[PDB]
Amino acid sequence: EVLTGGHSVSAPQENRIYVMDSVFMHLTESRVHVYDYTNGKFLGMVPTAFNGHVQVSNDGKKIYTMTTYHERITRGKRSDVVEVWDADKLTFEKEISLPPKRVQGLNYDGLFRQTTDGKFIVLQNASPATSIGIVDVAKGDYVEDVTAAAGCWSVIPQPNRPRSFMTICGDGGLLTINLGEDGKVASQSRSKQMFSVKDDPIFIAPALDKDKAHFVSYYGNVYSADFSGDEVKVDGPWSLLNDEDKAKNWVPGGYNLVGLHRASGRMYVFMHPDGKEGTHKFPAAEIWVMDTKTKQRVARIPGRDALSMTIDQQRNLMLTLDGGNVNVYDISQPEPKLLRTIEGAAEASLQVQFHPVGG
């Protein structure tokens, strides 16, 4: 026998999921673990140094990571970078230099995103002053720093426009940025106040539809942003809670804590009882399934202590993640059905993502 390298991942792209393991106890050796969700098989991994972030290119061909190096790890010159990796060979291809202020923080989806057209990476900076950075994938270059986003946080791409995204600002509104084909800001707009920052703060994780997004609040309300037009229209609150639910102090909690099934409008939310100040990151006691058209709950199921989720539209799946284990659910019908649990997918992950199949 002879040992060979050069091999591609052994399962098809459509079977692959990406568990971003922060490895917080050893945060300089964070990595992405690649799994086959159909059978739980480990397929490979991508090293991401200190507090890596990850996304897969919209076209499915490449993996993008964002990380920080120093010449001697704990001393020496800092290099913040985006790396482009081949999705099938799981090999490094290109390093893109960033200014030394990329966000170092837990793996919320909205910190490292891309334009719908896949031509630009859109990432959150904090120096601690906040701005949004734009990377031109074709050119392999950092091309724009959106200082207009100062005092705002996270990136919500608009799936109905090629190079547009929104961010949540300290005024309780949304700033929309439309990039030109050069990746520089082509125009921008600011919504009216959507939520009261002081009285009803929202979780940043969007339940993202093609032309609108929903957000849940610390107290179980729902806000919406409609971006079918150039100016975003905001509304809410409506409550996730009925009187009985309020009696037991049910509130949302988690990290990447919501999801939207676009075909049905069902929104999935991690919820726990006995809510009070300080419980907004508590593991789910239940997953609630909300009909976003009727603004009423349709189902509730055990939460399996999950903290983060993600949705695959085309196969009607929801993954949930408790920090170490990944649960795979069929959401083709209103009641989710548990298909399997992948045990030990990570040591400290708050983010799982499917390989794109939509192109």
């Binding site: 917080f24 106890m25 050893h26 945060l27 300089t28 200190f50 507090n51 920080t68 120093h70 790890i73 704990t74 001393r75 800092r78 202020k101 966000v103 170092q104 923080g105 837990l106 919320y108 959150q124 904090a126 120096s127 601690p128 906040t130 005092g151 705002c152 946080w153 996270s154 949540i168 600002c169 300290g170 920052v197 703060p201 929202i202 979780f203 940043i204 990290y255 100040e277 300080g278 419980t279 907004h280 990151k281």
Partner: protein, 120 residues
Amino acid sequence: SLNPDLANEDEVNSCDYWRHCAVDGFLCSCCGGTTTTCPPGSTPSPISWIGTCHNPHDGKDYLISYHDCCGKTACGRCQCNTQTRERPGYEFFLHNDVNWCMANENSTFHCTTSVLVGLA
């Protein structure tokens, strides 16, 4: 209640110690430091997120500044994830899911301190 160095070590090294009410990190007092001093060879952050914590001993509320100690790899001891009055990144200095070592000469996160600022 206001002087952790005079308090029971087991008490201050607990995530339920009153002033640790918005810590996402490793308590520096379990890492070779104290509540207000970095472990040897780790560097304080000039920036921090801020919590407001209730002191049950004296009944008053205090501003606490969660400076990190930086430039050494993860301490790994006394991990806490408490969230009283913590807010998301659009209220950035109330937010604890970011590395408050982010602006240090070396941003590697070592541990988190809980520095009493004064009455809220």
